[PDB]
Symmetry: C2
Subunit: 87 residues, 2 copies
């Protein structure tokens, strides 16, 4: 048996389950939603799109919502992304 | 339209493409190969397994190989994970 400590230099992104639950929450709203980081914007109602953004836990991203209920959508989704969901 | 810069506290992991290439390389070896971090261990010959470990680009993890070709497996995969290239 052998082992070696290594630095992950490969690209990371949101894991599948939290991306899928983010989309379930976003689906409760009619607004379109996006995430953007460093000039790359993805459709936040797409699990594959969400997972494609290069992100690491603790990093900053910009959440964007546009539509009739955009204000409510943004508040719910910001809480979700920041792990500050209300009871 | 409304926007908000938020901190991503959700879990992240390897993206699909880099995990698929990791598995393509790992499957060539007879040794069992795992990635381990904070007491969680995943199979490096599994795309969904690799993607299930919480990691961020830059994070240090432990690569483990056990088997007849464990040394060559460790060497090949450590180079892959760390984005190291041949002279």
């Amino acid at each position: 048996m052998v082992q070696q400590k290594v630095e992950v230099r490969l690209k990371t992104g949101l894991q599948a389950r939290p991306a899928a639950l983010f989309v379930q929450e976003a689906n409760r709203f009619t607004s379109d939603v996006f995430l953007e980081k460093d000039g790359k914007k993805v459709n936040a109602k797409s699990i594959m799109g969400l997972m494609s953004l290069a992100v690491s836990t603790g990093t900053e991203v910009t959440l964007i919502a546009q539509g009739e209920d955009e204000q409510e959508a943004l508040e719910k989704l910001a809480a979700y992304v920041q792990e500050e969901v209300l009871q």
